[PDB]
Amino acid sequence: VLMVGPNFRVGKKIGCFGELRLGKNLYTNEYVAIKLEPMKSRAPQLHLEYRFYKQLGSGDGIPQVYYFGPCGKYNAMVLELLGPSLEDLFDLCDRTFSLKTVLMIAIQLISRMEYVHSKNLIYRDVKPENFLIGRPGNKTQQVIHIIDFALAKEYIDPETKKHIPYREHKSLTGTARYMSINTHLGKEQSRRDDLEALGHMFMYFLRGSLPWQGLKADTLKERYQKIGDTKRATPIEVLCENFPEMATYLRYVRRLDFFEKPDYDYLRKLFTDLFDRKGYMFDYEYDWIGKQLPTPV
Ligand SMILES: CC(C)[C@H](CO)Nc1nc(Nc2cccc(Cl)c2)c2ncn(C(C)C)c2n1
């Protein structure tokens, strides 16, 4: 039987750098998530992720981390078990979300991203698969959590205490569908890029797709370039037709300077004012409420 530490039992695979396992804290009768990485790995990422989680600390919508240590031939990280991702739930809702659902998601994720940034980190891996509700049934099912900090970076260098310098010729980080235009161009990512990728994701949810999806090329590099070219060639006014506030959001974040602190309040208020004008109540009645939600246990 595979164990981590004195008390965490490692169970079945629930997903796939490394595997994700269902685990159980035997001391407390609580299920947990256990991320495994082979000790033999070329390019380990698990210890770096654990360090980022520790830097984030205890925050709203940040998964709790319980243990890091060896587990047979693996390094193991034991964390809070969460429910389905936004991609999973998007599929469950026939691949569109209502405006009310997208705004409840957006308001929370602007805050989630402000929190990450307040801990001197940029995220660099925005995608619907990395935002998870809490376990169906529990007190945090309503909370949209952010996971997977393997691609994060300290944007304030603790050596200098200053913002990281601008540079280019960076290897492309994250998912092509959502990444910022400046990420496509090989520029160092900063706070602006996290918020721009969120914007793309919001429009994906609202539209059901993005116009640069399904572009193919003979190489990965050429494919990224084509997606980038289409992002640049698609006017914000067109992409965000019928969603004026989203156009305002996207234009704002696209125009941020590399070093600039986003005005998180301004962006939230774009969406909360809209939310109010539409007469929505922030009651966490997402589109998926009432549906059969997948569960890890
Ligand atoms: C393995 C992936 C498909 C999913 C979604 O990205 N990842 C995932 N699923 C989690 N839960 C999960 C996995 C499969 C089905 C269901 Cl319903 C939930 C999960 N719980 C905690 N974390 C991290 C904080 C380690 C998690 N990460």
List all residues 6 or more positions away from 2 whose beta carbon is below 8 Å from its beta carbon.
9, 10, 71, 72
Quote the CA–CA distance of 42 and 242 in Å, as a whole number. Answer: 47
The residue extents of the domains of the chain are: 1-82, 83-297
Read off φ and ψ for residue 234, nearest 5 degrees.
Answer: -95, 105
Token couple for 223: 């494919």
Treating both helix axes as pointing N-terminal to C-terminal, what angle do 191-207 and 99-118 enclose, rounded to 10 degrees? 170
Task: Name the strand (E) or helix (H) holding 217.
Answer: none
- DSSP annotation of 173: P
Nearest CA, atom 10, ligand 1: 82
C-alpha torsion 110→115→117→119, nearest 10: -170
- DSSP annotation of 135: P
Token couple for 81: 């078990």
Read off φ and ψ for residue 20, nearest 5 degrees.
Answer: -105, 130
Ligand 1 centroid to Cα of residue 120, in Å, is: 25
CA angle 89, 230, 213 (to 5 degrees): 30
| 83-297 maps to CATH 1.10.510.10 | yes
Quote the CA–CA distance of 72 and 224 in Å, as a whole number. Answer: 39
Quote the CA–CA distance of 81 and 103 in Å, as a whole number. Answer: 25
> How was this model experimentally determined?
X-ray
- Which of 4, 32, 50, 81 has most ligand 1 atoms within 8 Å of CB, for mutation? 81
Task: Name the strand (E) or helix (H) holding 115.
Answer: helix 99-118
Class of domain 1-82: alpha beta
Q: Is the CB of 33 under 6 A from ligand 1?
A: yes
